[PDB]
Amino acid sequence: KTLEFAEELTEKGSVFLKENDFAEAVDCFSRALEIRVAHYGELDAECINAYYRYGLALLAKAQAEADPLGDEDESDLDMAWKMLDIARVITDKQSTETMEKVDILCSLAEVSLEREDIESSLSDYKNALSILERLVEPDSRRTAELNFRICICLETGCQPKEAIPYCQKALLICKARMERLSNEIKSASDKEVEIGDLAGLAEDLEKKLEDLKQQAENPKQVLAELM
């Protein structure tokens, strides 16, 4: 019932989650959240973390208990959505947007992908990216990553034309970060290793961009514009 006991439940839930004991992790995080809500209120800022942890554990559980070939799984997904969305709504009442909000939005996007809801995941990622563009440097790897996740959501959703500028942005971010590290060299070993890493990533992104431009030329994709 005390806050310290909720803290013990949270630490043990984290351990259970690392050890792939998803059921017990969800039980611990559920109990910690209930204690925190009873102390601070259902929609209080002090509960954000506990909602987030619980949502994350539920997502993990739903992913591990699904069989791709073919319910606890759908119920856990719906509850993960609920808990992460409450974390988001509470976060929305704070003046400054933080990386925790970015992360909550990315976790919500992943829930939506598991529910096969590409539109929601798209909105979640776009929101997260617009926050990230205020929080971190223009050539941040996290910004490149979110651009890429947007473009693959759009590709899987039959919108390759729209995916193209997001993939291009991810590629340009990788090359800009390359050139910036190159100028800084002008830890040196660490920067040069990262330059090579980014060059490989850029080539993978350039291949993805070629495939996207080809998909956007498919007759059904392009006829409306041609007409």
Partner: peptide, 15 residues
């Protein structure tokens, strides 16, 4: 569905 190569590339981009 999203290809596993694309998931891996997203994680590599993030690092």
């Amino acid at each position: 569905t999203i290809m596993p190569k694309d998931i891996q590339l997203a994680r590599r981009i993030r690092g």
